[PDB]
Ligand binder design. Structure first.
Ligand SMILES: Cc1cc([C@@H]2CN(C(=O)c3ccc(F)c(F)c3)CC(F)(F)C2)n2ncnc2n1
Ligand SMILES: [Mg+2]
Ligand SMILES: [Zn+2]
Length: 342
């Protein structure tokens, strides 16, 4: 019923102009997690409208309103992999569209697929990684462990289940060819969010950046879509320091909850998921150096206007070294007590 009245307003009230959301809404400096969650479904419609997808693809407005709410409701509330993550990843896709001239690189339908994939790419995340699905012998591992990318296959399957819900198939007027294309793109893009997949294709991404993007090379299109999806997925690290500090809190809260579960199963968690071993500043520096910075360096190599993104990621990484000394207890704790020693 609450879904129903939210739908009624989303459908009949009109799509707010994107500029009314925030006067910096289309800037790389904007932090979409500042938007109240109650306003995010309308902001999705505003972005879809501003990218001209609603008109270009003649999306049915009741269907689209239903779809957007179904996707939002398809996220649970772990500390990090929740709807506000999917919303902020989608918003970064919109930023890429508005700032980087993606139409010189990608087909319209590929840009559309990228944005819809961003909305859907973590659907029904339970706050645990692929390794945990296998180790805990979850239903998801029973379905997909033999293919790999367990969670990402689930996210994709959830996206399809939403489309296959009556009243929610925003593509169902597409030609059979275009429908097959959209769903194939969604598969490839959502599966690209597995960082194991990123790490596997990284050399090919480097080689594409080295030789130069060839808009007539179908494999270049696929590679670029993967890179852009990863860039959206990690885009929290391209904001200022307070965003990255908070996002670190959320990720490690989620990780440490998984680690507590693995210990209860008699298994040794990864150091980064073990609240007794993980040293957050060094793990964040390592993640920035070895994963985040190279991704945004490739993005800048391909799109010079993305330079500020890489510079911000590098700065945030420098901040971690600067604050690391504060994880060492000087003097006495604030209570003047050493009772934590016992
Ligand atoms: C935006 C953002 C997203 C993630 C993570 C990265 N992920 C990892 O596997 C991972 C995590 C920590 C590491 F140190 C590492 F080497 C790998 C997958 C994920 F958990 F989904 C999201 N992190 N992690 C730390 N700061 C992050 N910032
Ligand atoms: Mg994911
Ligand atoms: Zn994600």
């Amino acid at each position: 019923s609450a879904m129903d009245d939210e739908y009624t307003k989303l459908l009949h009230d009109g799509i707010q102009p994107v500029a009314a959301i925030d006067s910096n809404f289309a800037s790389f400096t904007y932090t979409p997690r500042s938007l109240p969650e109650d306003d995010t479904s309308m902001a999705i419609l505003s972005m879809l409208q501003d990218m001209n997808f609603i008109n270009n693809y003649k999306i049915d407005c009741p269907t689209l309103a239903r779809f957007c709410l179904m996707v939002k409701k398809g996220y649970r509330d772990p500390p990090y992999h929740n709807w506000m993550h999917a919303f902020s990843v989608s918003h970064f896709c919109y930023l890429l569209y508005k700032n980087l001239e993606l139409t010189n690189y990608l087909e319209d339908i590929e840009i559309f697929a990228l944005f819809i994939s961003c909305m859907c790419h973590d659907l029904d995340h339970r706050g645990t990684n692929n390794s945990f699905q296998v180790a805990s012998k979850s239903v998801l591992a029973a379905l997909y462990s033999s293919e790999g990318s367990v969670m990402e296959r689930h996210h994709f399957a959830q996206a399809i289940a939403i489309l296959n819900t009556h009243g929610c198939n925003i593509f169902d007027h597409f030609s059979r060819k275009d429908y097959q294309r959209m769903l194939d793109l969604m598969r490839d893009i959502i599966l690209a969010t597995d960082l194991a997949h990123h790490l596997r294709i990284f050399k090919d991404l480097q080689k594409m950046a080295e030789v130069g993007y060839d808009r007539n090379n179908k494999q270049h299109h696929r590679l670029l879509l993967c890179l852009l999806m990863t860039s959206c997925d990690l885009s929290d690290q391209t904001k200022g320091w307070k965003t990255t500090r908070k996002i670190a809190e959320l990720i490690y809260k989620e990780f440490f909850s998984q680690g507590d579960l693995e210990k209860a199963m008699g298994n040794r968690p990864m150091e980064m998921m073990d609240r007794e071993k993980a040293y957050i500043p060094e793990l964040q520096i390592s993640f920035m150096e070895h994963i985040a910075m190279p991704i945004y360096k490739l993005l800048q190599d391909l799109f010079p206007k993305a330079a500020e993104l890489y510079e911000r990621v590098a700065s945030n990484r420098e901040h971690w070294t600067k604050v690391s000394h504060k994880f060492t207890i000087r003097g006495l704790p604030s209570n003047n007590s050493l009772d934590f020693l016992d």
